[PDB]
Amino acid sequence: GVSVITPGTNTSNQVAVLYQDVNCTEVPSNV
Amino acid sequence: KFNGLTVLPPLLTDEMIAQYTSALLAGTITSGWTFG
Ligand SMILES: *[C@@H]1O[C@H](CO)[C@@H](O)[C@H](O)[C@H]1NC(C)=O
Numbered sequence: 001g002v003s004v005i006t007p008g009t010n011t012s013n014q015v016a017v018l019y020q021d022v023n024c025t026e027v028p029s030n031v
Numbered sequence: 032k033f034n035g036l037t038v039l040p041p042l043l044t045d046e047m048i049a050q051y052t053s054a055l056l057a058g059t060i061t062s063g064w065t066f067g
Pocket residue numbers: 010011
């Protein structure tokens with residue numbers, strides 16, 4: 001699954017993304 | 032691991048829960064029922 005972490009659009013429009021139990025070397029800054 | 036089936040981890044680790052029980056246990060050995 002892919003999850004999106006947001007502080008709320010009434011605070012900011014930045015976003016972070018969690019790729020669930022995926023090794024972070026095969027996803028396709030801060031990794 | 033499988034086909035469309037996954038297992039999500041719990042939010043509190045086992046280390047955190049053992050920390051919680053040692054705080055309860057040190058509160059009761061030392062203050063009785065006053066800390067609750
Ligand atoms: C939501 O927006 C309103 C007005 O734009 C503001 O008063 C309120 O503090 C905002 N809420 C948060 C959690 O920032």
